[PDB]
Design a protein around this ligand. Sequence first.
Ligand SMILES: CC(=O)NCc1cn[nH]c1
Ligand SMILES: [Zn+2]
Ligand SMILES: [Zn+2]
Length: 582
Amino acid sequence: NLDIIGKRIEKIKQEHETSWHYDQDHPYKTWAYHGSYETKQTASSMVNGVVRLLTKPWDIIPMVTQMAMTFKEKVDTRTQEPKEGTKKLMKITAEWLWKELGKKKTPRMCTREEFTRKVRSNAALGAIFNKWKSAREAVEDSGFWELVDKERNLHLEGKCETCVYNMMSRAIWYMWLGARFLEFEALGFLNEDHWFSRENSLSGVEGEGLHKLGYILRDVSKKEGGAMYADDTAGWDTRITLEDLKNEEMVTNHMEGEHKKLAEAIFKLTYQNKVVRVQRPTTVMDIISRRDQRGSGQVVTYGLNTFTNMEAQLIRQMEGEGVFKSIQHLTVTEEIAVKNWLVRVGRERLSRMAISGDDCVVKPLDDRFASALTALNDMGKVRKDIQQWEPSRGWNDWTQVPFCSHHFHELIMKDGRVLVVPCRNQDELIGRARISQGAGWSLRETACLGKSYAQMWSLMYFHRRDLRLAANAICSAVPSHWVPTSRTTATHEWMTTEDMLTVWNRVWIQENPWMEDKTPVESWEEIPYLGKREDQWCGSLIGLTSRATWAKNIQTAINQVRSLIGNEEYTDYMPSMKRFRR
Ligand SMILES: CC(=O)NCc1cn[nH]c1
Ligand SMILES: [Zn+2]
Ligand SMILES: [Zn+2]
């Protein structure tokens, strides 16, 4: 408790010594509360006018238009201590999993140089504004690095002064850039060196890309076994136990020297003990603490979520296969049985999964998995939207399984070759492309964000009639040479000024390990669509009068946007489609 967080608390006390008051009407039950101080401040979603002017039919679709308008009673909940048998299963599994992940990788520190390059090309490193304006400026000033050094030597001493979270089914815990650096220095290797790649982790998909996820799910479907299970957890980040955080910390067992000590300090001082500042309108700033739940940088959160989800799903698989009888207590011979299962079939069982942070798809040996719930519930990974003890419903067809907010279609090209393509309800895609985040967007910056969405649609969603047409229209409306942008950045092959047909060929043909015939596609007309009825099922407006008028008059919409942007160099991409090809 207060020996580890006291220093951080003491320091904040003094910078607001004219405001410190131990409030009596504090709303916290599961968070430890320490005091309050005076503040007064808040970033809503803005519409992208380039995308909206080129998607007129969707102006009257509420699922699209409502997306642009507008649980902290789940962050304030508590998770019970797992039973001794559960804790044993998790420790054995975690020990075995870090060794497997470490077989072909070497833990290492990430560098000021690496951190500096990241910031100088905009990655969402959840930092705060003070002394320097942006992250870009702090990184060039040697005063910052002297602050970093003071904290670093403090961490080596087993103490913390400035690693404090700022709070803001979503919850993002910003820290000052210095704290983020020290986290990246110790644990950045997990992401930077691809520990959760599919080649390295067998269950993972880190770096895989939306054009690969469908092929990965189809490969899992080819295994002998039961239904495909895709159970979502109710608020995964809030269900991370102190036992989970202790099994995650065992990655430090694979480290040495300085690194081992720096990593151990991040786990002890920032993850297993946390200090947070929250805005309350009653507007004061609350300084609260707790030991458990997830609150790291988003990128370390992704890797440790993937790790602990892989662990939980192997244990649920063990339960279905009858490897252990009860979570109350593992016998001595059950421990040897669990260890022996992992050595004998662990890697095979990992290959039966696709795991992306809190999101999973499992194809178990058989459907006993469906009612194997005791370990999963006792670890605190309670399933969303189903009663605690009600057996999971599995999917009989890999094309119906939800994963990473998508489903996947099998699409046969006129030439016989097989594409496995990502899909989701088209209102979601159009509604997201119509939204920007943040202030001070020029017309040129807004146009370049529209072009980023258009090129993503050309590469990932070319099989949706409305998106291929809207992508061609946006790319026709934005100057040919303007570079696509995004203020918050998997593999983003659409972020380029290269011709999108050349990029399509590289991604779907040349570099696609599931495509044996490498014959390049010569035109967009060789590239197929979903069936017309399937396109409507997934939200297409094909068949509506609104959509027919839009498609027929598209050059008028394109001209409207060109007239606003001004006298620039434009390309007509519409004749890449049959119906505009005269
Ligand atoms: C309709 C269109 O192409 N407008 C572009 C433009 C603006 N000024 N001169 C040409
Ligand atoms: Zn610290
Ligand atoms: Zn679909």
